[PDB]
Amino acid sequence: MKSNEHDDCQVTNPSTGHLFDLSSLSGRAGFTAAYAKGWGVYMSICGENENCPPGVGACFGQTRISVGKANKRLRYVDQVLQLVYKDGSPCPSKSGLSYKSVISFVCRPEAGPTNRPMLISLDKQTCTLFFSWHTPLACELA
């Protein structure tokens, strides 16, 4: 109840007071941010992904690579909205944390048709998929 790590996924900009609710992007069917033809990332923004086993937040590849558990903990850090989905693939790596996806939502009023998550970089060492989503919802307007 009102606990952002499981109830709701909205975070408030303490500067303007703008509440950023990304429940609009809660397409649990899986937004597909491709990596290569045939295999991309099936992610849901706050909402257990129904395309894969329910509970997963993002899926990578064609097989069953989990890019983290579906967290609802929308954060606001470095003037961007950040969603980190940890505990998916237990990757044997340098640190080998988990194949966590870090979705960084960046303000962009012109992100109407370009309102999609884009994989910026793939760090295999810390197993982190860096996504940038251009969204007007992440805009700190008054």
TrEMBL record:
Cellular localization per UniProt: Endosome membrane; Golgi apparatus membrane
Domain MRH: 7-141
Functional description taken from the UniProt entry: Mediates the transport of phosphorylated lysosomal enzymes from the Golgi complex and the cell surface to lysosomes. Lysosomal enzymes bearing phosphomannosyl residues bind specifically to mannose-6-phosphate receptors in the Golgi apparatus and the resulting receptor-ligand complex is transported to an acidic prelysosomal compartment where the low pH mediates the dissociation of the complex. The receptor is then recycled back to the Golgi for another round of trafficking through its binding to the retromer. This receptor also binds IGF2.
Assembly mode: Binds HA-I and HA-II plasma membrane adapters. Interacts with DPP4; the interaction is direct. Binds GGA1, GGA2 and GGA3. Interacts with the heterotrimeric retromer cargo-selective complex (CSC), formed by VPS26 (VPS26A or VPS26B), VPS29 and VPS35; which is involved in retrograde trafficking of the receptor from endosomes to the Golgi apparatus.
Family classification: Belongs to the MRL1/IGF2R family.
Protein name, per record: Cation-independent mannose-6-phosphate receptor
Species lineage: Eukaryota, Metazoa, Chordata, Craniata, Vertebrata
